[PDB]
């Protein structure tokens, strides 16, 4: 759909990235490309000569035009910058004889930038920029998967959409003929920092200007909404430790008062800060008590957490794992949660239904499969204790805001460095 003229997608039969658009453009993958073992569409391009992908376009879809509209879309994940770049570097190039289109990255004045450049055969350039600050407590963008869509209307504007939403437009109507290349080079080109890399997936080209609705539907269809995601946007997994971010108070972190059914877990603050003047100023994410999601009812062989999976939650306390559990017979709607010894869980409630996209992800069950409530928090004499509460289940269908039950799961990731765990 959408006049797609290139659709880079992993194919099991040939066991490689191929063009699935129907035009059979050849995809040459360098030896220095790395792939995710969990999602084989995710590819990592590092700052090495062999870490490159080259597309040899079907000769009928090469762009050589003054008036034809075209669009591109892709997902990208860019590590946090710890050093000034001021050093714009290419990542996706379709240029010949100084004409064509190009995606480049830069980091300047605490802003990470994604730059779209068009250049016509008279040498006239137009650029459109998406940028985001590194001076921010918790970013929607730093080191997290971003869905990018760039549309080009030769009569008027080039537009950048980010996660399905128009965020910038620049006039391109004065550009003349644009004669782009026979091939597309995916490769960090001109980057002076040897540690830089990117992750990318699902690169597409379209020979029209996509509209708002097509882009939102593209964002949704490529989102894999049946699979829960961690904070970085990767697949949520079993047997993987996660730090917990509560979106209703993000400046707090999780702690355990004591283990055992008489103890409780609670949110304390403030979150720390990781700071270097004129480079970054962020809240620390690798803090507090870790959760590990454990398989219960799911029979899938793989370690991917899916919508409506029934799981156990283990809690890590001084390098030892306990079970998140509660006695559903305690008084009140709010059931205070405990970290109990795994052999001693007995008949305490412990089964959690995981829910993908609000963002309330954990619905605790009793052993009749009845809802005890989403896991959130509640104030008990100025202590914000962790609770399962059916108040959430009655409420999150009424409004569309953040609730105390809205969480993100944060694993340690190479693209986000901190001193303390
Ligand atoms: Cl169009
Ligand atoms: Cl999710």
Residue numbers in the entry: 862 to 1218, 1225 to 1288
Give verbatim excerpts from the published study on this entry.
Botulinum neurotoxin (BoNT) is the active agent that causes the deadly condition botulism. The smaller 50 kDa light chain (LC) possesses a single zinc-endopeptidase domain whereas the larger 100 kDa heavy chain is comprised of two domains—a target cell receptor binding (HC) domain and a translocation (HN) domain. The BoNT HC domain is responsible for targeting the toxin to a specific cell type and the specific receptors involved have been identified for most serotypes. As with all reported structures of the BoNT receptor binding domain, present is a characteristic β-jellyroll fold at the N-terminal half and a predominantly β-trefoil fold at the C-terminal half of the protein.
Recently, a new bivalent strain of Clostridium botulinum, IBCA10-7060, was reported to produce BoNT/B2 and a previously unknown BoNT serotype—“BoNT/H”. This novel toxin is a mosaic molecule and is now more commonly referred to as BoNT/FA (as well as BoNT/HA) due to a LC similar to that of BoNT/F5, a HN domain similar to that of BoNT/F1, and a HC domain similar to that of BoNT/A1. Here, we present a new crystal structure of HC/FA at 1.95 Å resolution which reveals further structural information that is unresolved in the reported structure. We identified crystallisation conditions which yielded crystals of HC/FA in space group P422, with two molecules related by non-crystallographic symmetry in the asymmetric unit. However, it further reveals the presence of a loop (R1261–R1268) that has been shown in other subtypes to be involved in ganglioside receptor binding. Crystal packing has enabled neighbouring chains to interact directly with this loop, provide sufficient stabilisation to produce good electron density.
